[PDB]
Design a protein around this ligand. Structure first.
Ligand code: HEM
Ligand code: HEM
Lengths: 145, 145
């Protein structure tokens, strides 16, 4: 359940989440777009869910893609800020799950973002330790899908 | 049209938005719920759009309501952060408009949030000058609806 998943966010996991976000969240536009372009490059199959965005290969030049990219980063910002209170984290995660469920995005599909996060993290000198911390956070959302 | 509305966001207006947000945005859960509950108190009809939240009368205690309220505040956080780059503000605004358009929320309906904002700002001692600044921000989103 989503409540058991949130419980997996131990003290050190939270610290690693915050330490890496401090760097990653510094450039929401740049890193957000990097996240999305990497998702589409490594998982071409997911592009079909983003028809509304148009030519996703345009990257930063695509206004709609940039809109979603920036907004996605503020969702991660939201999760990080809620790490202190599990009750606030869960209600925020559930709200986000709802919008994805409507788009028929499954937990397995949603988890595909772990690859991109791992890559952007590594580009900034954050290794497996951090990628795993982030996978734990994503898992909380997966538990709600 | 959206770009034209963004043009109303002058140097002084942006300055008031940023200064008032420094306080209002410091307690997203508290001020977010204050906004939603006020909207529902002054415009009871708007509740028809939020059937999914269940018993909104529980206010802060309602997890679904709390979830939407906190998330609402990060949308505003997003807008505030994009004030200095019209191209980014616009793409982010249009993204957020899309979701409301889908729910059949007209520009007139959207403008009802202006009252709650004015009251919330006033509770923190930010008068008409600031309320007016915020009305202009909301007007940018209305331009996209
Ligand atoms: C941890 C990773 C993810 C986060 C935090 C996230 C966050 C977001 C946010 C905040 C939005 C914008 C608001 C909205 O329209 O609901 C959004 C939209 C969307 N997301 Fe995600 N998402 C994630 C992963 C994914 C994945 C892996 C897929 C699909 C394989 C997906 C599919 C969608 C779709 C289809 C949209 C609609 C885009 C549009 O047309 O505007 N998301 N996501
Ligand atoms: C300052 C103005 C407002 C902002 C910044 C805002 C922001 C948001 C955000 C960020 C969400 C969550 C993401 C999503 O699901 O789209 C949302 C959802 C929603 N908004 Fe607003 N909103 C505003 C005004 C309004 C008004 C006045 C109405 C209607 C009278 C409205 C109706 C809705 C509805 C029905 C939802 C879906 C809630 C749910 O079931 O999760 N919004 N809004």
């Amino acid at each position: 359940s989503v409540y058991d998943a949130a419980a997996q966010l131990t003290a050190d996991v939270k610290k690693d989440l915050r330490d890496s976000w401090k760097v990653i969240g510094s450039d929401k536009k740049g890193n957000g777009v990097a996240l999305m372009t990497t998702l589409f490059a490594d998982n071409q199959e997911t592009i079909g869910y983003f028809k509304r965005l148009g030519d996703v290969s345009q990257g930063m030049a695509n206004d709609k893609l940039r809109g979603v990219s920036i907004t996605l980063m503020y969702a991660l910002q939201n999760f990080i800020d809620q790490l202190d209170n599990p009750d606030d984290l869960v209600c925020v995660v559930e709200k986000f799950a709802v919008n994805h469920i409507t788009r028929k995005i499954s937990a397995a599909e949603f988890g595909k973002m772990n690859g991109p996060i791992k890559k952007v993290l590594a580009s900034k000198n954050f290794g497996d330790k951090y990628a795993n911390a982030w996978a734990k956070l994503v898992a909380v959302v997966q538990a709600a899908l």
